[PDB]
């Protein structure tokens, strides 16, 4: 059939993180002057287009499930066969089946029930990433940045909070910034530094053992 969709049938993301489902679609047109808007939609399996809220869509009229507003986002150009569903801030609840649909003019209307998707939202194991130039020299200010791999800025901003006896010397105020500059002491050497990240209730932290020197 001229109706065909390109996209892996099953997928998985760690809760709180975000995956990227590349997708592509074709549909019989009937080109010539006539150029009505092309609307596509992602729906949860089981729902009826006519009365369902989109999981994601480019139709500025169709309501979007409050649940997914901001997290499921269609990428690229649709005029260019692109139906890539960028899933963000995976939530256990998102686990499920999903179908795609196109609508153009009065006669092009179809839900690809042959090529469904399967989102599996597994628990979060990933731990942040503490990163510093590797100087680790006493009496010298260095900058550490903490980040969670494979994370989008789709959902509510992530929160940072460092920990370790090496922190007590500074202001409990600037211990909440993603990045943290520090000036180590002999005491700090061999101490545990930690970074915890939340999404505005997960457990993600990376503790590193300091190697201050000279």
Swiss-Prot record:
Limits of the Ig-like V-type domain: 2-118
Domain of life: Eukaryota
Positions bearing carbohydrate: 82, 192, 211
Residue numbers binding N-acetylneuraminate: 101, 109, 111
Tissues in which the UniProt entry reports expression: Expressed by monocytic/myeloid lineage cells. Found at high levels in peripheral blood leukocytes, spleen, bone marrow and at lower levels in lymph node, lung, appendix, placenta, pancreas and thymus. Expressed by monocytes and neutrophils but absent from leukemic cell lines representing early stages of myelomonocytic differentiation.
Region (Disordered): 171-192
Cysteine pairings via disulfide bonds: 18-152, 23-83, 146-195
Compartments where found: Membrane
Domain (Ig-like C2-type) ranges: 128-209
Role this protein plays: Putative adhesion molecule that mediates sialic-acid dependent binding to cells. Binds equally to alpha-2,3-linked and alpha-2,6-linked sialic acid. The sialic acid recognition site may be masked by cis interactions with sialic acids on the same cell surface.
Domain notes: Contains 1 copy of a cytoplasmic motif that is referred to as the immunoreceptor tyrosine-based inhibitor motif (ITIM). This motif is involved in modulation of cellular responses. The phosphorylated ITIM motif can bind the SH2 domain of several SH2-containing phosphatases.
Family: Belongs to the immunoglobulin superfamily. SIGLEC (sialic acid binding Ig-like lectin) family.
Name of this chain's protein: Sialic acid-binding Ig-like lectin 5
Gene name of the record: SIGLEC5
Range of the intact protein held here: 20 to 233 of 551
